């Protein structure tokens, strides 16, 4: 879903402050969503690796 959006909006996604705010909120939400499926204790600092 991201490769379909970033390639079609190659110059547009860099020159839109509201579009970058949606990406930083969604990517932090999915890393929150995938971490709950592993354990459900709300971890403090999950490793990005």
């Amino acid at each position: 879903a991201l490769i379909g959006l970033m390639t079609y909006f190659r110059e547009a996604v860099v020159n839109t402050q509201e579009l970058l705010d949606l990406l930083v909120k969604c990517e932090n939400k999915i890393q929150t969503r995938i971490k709950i499926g592993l354990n459900s204790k709300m971890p403090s600092r999950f490793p990005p690796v």
Binding site: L38, S40, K41, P43
Partner: protein
């Protein structure tokens, strides 16, 4: 089995049970104590050892993280001069210390994590904690905390050494951490679990 699981983690909790299915982790500690005793008995004449007389222990000794009793001890013959306490890699050892006659070696495996790969620092930490303020059954003058990390496959030791035992235990730990009959069963369980 001694594997510390921090969170709930319902996926990886059962997978560690599937690896440590039967009494295999306790059989690792029995295999290392038998393998190091066989290397000590094969060179007991030149090392001035009287009799390798490794006594029995509690069957859940490796499970208990608090106490650390003498597992594989070695009676020296006579005029045995102990050395300064150092790690298993410090080549600048000094034998200017007290002279004892009874000497032990306590092996304690520890399944480490990402923030516990300092197996050399962990070996001196477990020895100095279990030396004076231990409240555990151990002989007084000297010991050896020959630790073996199960996760990172790291081998390290710390404590007061014996003359001629520092190249002896280093050559024995290479044949104990590699090609062991228990560690080969451990590596076969992980590779079958991950395919």
């Amino acid at each position: 089995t001694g594997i510390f699981m921090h969170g709930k983690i319902p996926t990886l909790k059962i997978s560690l049970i599937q690896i440590f299915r039967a009494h295999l982790w306790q059989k690792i500690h029995e295999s290392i104590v038998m393998d190091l005793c066989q290397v000590f008995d094969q060179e007991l004449d030149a090392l001035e050892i009287e009799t390798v007389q490794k006594e029995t222990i509690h069957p859940r000794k490796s499970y208990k993280m608090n106490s650390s009793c003498a597992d594989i001890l070695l009676f020296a013959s006579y005029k045995w001069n102990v050395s300064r306490p150092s790690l298993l890699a410090d080549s600048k050892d000094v034998m200017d210390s007290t002279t004892t006659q009874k000497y032990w070696i306590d092996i304690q495996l520890r399944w480490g994590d990402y923030d516990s790969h300092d197996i050399e620092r962990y070996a001196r930490a477990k020895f100095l904690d279990y030396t004076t303020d231990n409240m555990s059954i151990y002989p007084s003058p000297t010991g050896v905390l020959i630790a073996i990390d199960l996760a990172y496959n790291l081998h390290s030791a710390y404590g007061n050494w014996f003359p001629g035992s520092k190249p002896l235990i280093q050559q024995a730990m290479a044949k104990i951490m590699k090609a062991n009959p228990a560690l080969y069963v451990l590596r076969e369980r992980i590779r079958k679990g991950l395919q």
